[PDB]
């Protein structure tokens, strides 16, 4: 019941080659923590302004003044969150955005390893600290699992068997968990990248009018970190157990965007339902963290809709109690995608909306 | 010719259309089975008015109407009712479930697969038309199929028929009386369609008509039949200028030119003065001045709003029957002197006047008395903002906790779109508050 | 056509289904041999909602019957309306569940579920536009719990977007018939919460109280309780079969009544009920039906609504009546009893009207409530469950069928969570920090 503060971050990518060749226009402005969007259809009306915790102008690659470099993004989010994980408390990071926007850049980064995402940098720092602090008494263990949620059904990506629906159980002491989920040990961030690539190969994708291989399912990479202290005592026990989750949320979907009936509509409805449930649970968490942190009066137990989706249910231990949360939202800068970006901004308005101005 | 197409969406639209076509058939002497003995008896005239009916070689008259609804249960009453032979068999039923008070269902997961057929039928009707002037879309806020399918249909019609007028005769939720829990969500989501694609949206309230029936007509237990008949009378009074002769006729373009100052404030109230029972038809002069004054009484308005809490900016009076312009001018002069009826300083002209010789018709088995004179008022006023504000409050009370939201987003709706609609609606209120301010 | 597939499992479910089909056949004027001898044309306007048509101008109900004990089937066949049903739909085994949820779910029911689902698939494929299902069972813990929940899960997996309605009889504190009611009730409520859209709570204690106090019956039997449940079942779906001034489809009720996905447990009710002694002293009007519907003693769930708050309410009237009176009465009920209604919903009384009343009444009404008081029922079961699970009173009968102990805990946790949900909106204020 310690609470879990949530940080809301938005980032803008540069123009792609096709948009750069075409005479496209930027529609996004940023000032401190305020982000404003201007409609291209009627530019003369007004720009809608929103407030978030962090606003990242990664628009111009050679820019010198106020450029949100990937290392800067790490230093705001991933470094603090890894440090929180080291203390023995749970951690979860979320990624949201439409296809053609960032997401992959934010989480993974470029393949040349000159500019990296949150995942590889966090893994490198974790393992470097492990090698630094591992004395004769310490013992650090790392395990990894990677699963997907698709129509509120859990599937394993690492294990190549017939892709049946795994069963979700509730250990009375350890909370929710998944039965018969592959768990593997790892010894370097290279192993993490290999397992993540193999899992991403097996994810469920489909063809729509927005993209040829749009994501149709959520995916989570749980990093289980275990610390054992062989102190000068007659009883040596595992001192702490903490988990780090990296969540890849599929973007929202509208009916007119995908006119196909049957499977595609059901997938879109399920994704939308899971997204609104996640918005509700994160917003309730943000409010409950904000309140006690200043008042220090525990109002009964409040409430939070854990059992409204499999995603929120399985992340119950990470989402709340004693943990930290943070979500990064990616935005396109081109006018052509305006409406889509606005939808993303609206989903970023949740999680303790800041009013200001 | 002068020709208008009527479209009925949802149960409210279908029943209002039943009442309207009863009234029209009674007016023009057309039997329920489509024949007219009057032409055979006389051998002349033009009683097969093209404003609502199309003639075939056999003397049968087909109405210019399209009925649409996803429930088969309300249209099958018409297809097996008294007027089963009047309408063309293309009644356009979707053999599936209803939108179920869900805007998303009526809009873009089940409203499709029938919109194409509806647009094809509308195109077929319009191709037979030579001088098509506008559309009369009947629907109802709050319901699912009404709001959603009206949004889709008006969007498509504006794409295809962007020049022609599109009038709405819709029912607005009442302050306290309502028959649904998720009604404010649908009503707020209807704002985009009733703003961008509608040219003049008339709104009525069930509570106001119930009060009118209780007080004026002394009907203590009215049903939807009386409400539909009153709305039919108002629509007939509006449309009478295109059918019968008169000293001063008012076309649809004249309505749109005179009533709306600016494009975004095309939301006028409507009212009907001589609503009186047969017993109370006696003991009353019912002169032009009396009915003209009765129009302005706040108790007779069909939307639960107070005109005294606002300023009139455009009034249009349509007189029917034995009415002479001298009495109308005297009534306008009398009205302009009263201080309770406040007009905007930037519309010194004030009133539009139209007179038509054809008196009203009494529907057999009805409740309105036979009256030589009648009048219908249309009035653009700021008080309508009040009728919006209360509903706006209701929306907040359900959107703060995201109640019932999962049903809508389960059918291809983005949550943020709700807020978008709210934002647009808020602008409307401010716009009204901008126009009532005195000039400087 | 909006067409429904009806299923019934267990003794309670099968008997309620038999009485319900008797009531529906009387409403549509169906001869017990299957022929039609009705009075009006509206009876066959929407006969496809519940019946299929045979080549001999006979109407076979779209019903499927399930029971692991064959005896329950025989009493249905040797009855007033035994011959009406299709013989191929009498799916049954030859080994009773013995009031063991594990036997009905894992061991015995797992073999008959394939045949039952094959019959359900055959019936559904013949339906030109399927709307939803309608399962009648009980939480006593025999076939109705195990096979009921298993069929619910299987049908939900096969047909995800269709409506799933269930009429379920809950245990009671003061009237009991089996020793292991709490275990089976909790395990069934888990699956009911997971995989249903509407669940109408029914209590034997409430029905007995209605019979004793309202109907003034001296020796009530199971037939009268079945009759009341049948009246409620017909009133719920009346709007699908007849025209009216304001229709209410099943999906309309599901959308208007369920604010959040897990809160879909409903308290039914029916009016009028006059006892046949004071019938001539009672004036039948919409205000009288409104007064009787909201009365605490008329509820069928044995939960006092005055101990909580109404999340939503629905009233389906049948008969010729003016809608101004109906709306005024609903508004007056909301205003006069404002303390018992949730305040963050501006209006929480869905209304529907139909022009065709029951056969022998001028007008009637069906009530569906959704209030926090229902939590009390669950709480009672939970208490009893603890009293047996702390010591493992009868667990060895379940674990012998391959059921793990942990599952019990899971169910209990889910049950408790549901109670907390219904407790969230119960308090009539939120100011204090
Ligand atoms: C006033 C009048 O005309 O006579 C009534 C009557 O006196 C009362 C007492 C009836 C009577 O009901 C009972 O005695 C009864 C006892 C236990 C459980 C249920 C009913 C009646 O038997 C019940 C019977 O009801 C019907 O016919 C309805 O259609 C009803 N049942 C059946 O149609 C039916 C069909 C086949 C076999 C058995 C019953 C119904 C209600 C809702 C939906 C569908 C059907 C009628 C007219 C009466 C009597 C005969 C005394 C009542 O019946 C109901 C539930 O509607 C109980 O109080 C109500 C209304 C009346 O006051
Ligand atoms: N004045 C008047 N109002 C009506 C009438 N019929 C329905 N309404 C109103 O219309 C609202 C719902 O309209 P509809 O969209 O047609 O409802 P529906 O036919 O069941 O279709 P769905 O809303 O999609 O389920 C109700 O809340 C009523 O208040 C009528 O005959 N007269
Ligand atoms: N209302 C009603 N309840 C019944 C009837 N018969 C049995 N019950 C209830 O059903 C419970 C017994 O469960 P049962 O149906 O026999 O188990 P199963 O048939 O093997 O699945 C008891 O608590 C009874 O109250 C009936 O005819 N009407
Ligand atoms: N500094 C930056 N911040 C965010 N995005 C960037 C940056 N630099 C380049 N990008 C672009 O981000 C895109 C992310 O790739 P893509 O696979 O489209 O992501 P998604 O998985 O969202 O489709 C790349 O195409 C890349 O060009
Ligand atoms: Mg409808």
Residue numbers in the entry:
A (entry chain K): 1 to 357
B (entry chain A): 1 to 440
C (entry chain B): 1 to 433
Sentences from the paper on this structure:
In conditions with ADP or without nucleotides (Apo state), only classes with single MT-bound heads were detected, lacking a visible connection to their partner head domains. This configuration represents a state where one head is MT-bound while the tethered partner head is unbound and mobile. Extra densities near the MT-bound motor in both Apo and ADP states hint that the unbound head partially explores the space behind the bound motor domain, as also suggested by the backward orientation of the linker’s initial segment in these structures. The structure of the MT-bound motor domain was similar in both conditions except for the presence or absence of ADP in the nucleotide-binding pocket. In the one-head-bound configuration of KIF1A observed in the presence of ADP and in the Apo state, the neck linker is undocked and extends backward towards the MT minus-end. Beyond the fourth neck-linker residue (N357), cryo-EM densities become notably weaker, indicating increased mobility in this region. Notably, in the KIF1A ADP dataset, about 36% of the signal near the tubulin was unassigned, compared to a maximum of 5% in the other datasets. This significant portion of weak signal could represent weakly bound mobile motors, consistent with the expected lower MT affinity in the ADP state. The open conformation we observed in high-resolution KIF1A-MT complexes, both in ADP and Apo states and in the leading head with bound AMP-PNP, represents, to the best of our knowledge, a novel conformation for the KIF1A motor domain. Our comparison between the crystal structures and the high-resolution KIF1A-MT complexes shows that MT binding directly induces the nucleotide-binding pocket’s transition from a semi-closed to an open conformation, providing a structural explanation for the enhanced ADP release associated with kinesin-MT binding.
KIF1A, a key member of the kinesin-3 family, is recognized for its high processivity and fast MT plus-end-directed motility. These attributes are crucial for the long-distance transport of cargoes in neurons. Mutations in the microtubule-associated motor protein KIF1A lead to severe neurological conditions known as KIF1A-associated neurological disorders (KAND). Here, we present 2.7-3.5 Å resolution structures of dimeric microtubule-bound KIF1A, including the pathogenic P305L mutant, across various nucleotide states.
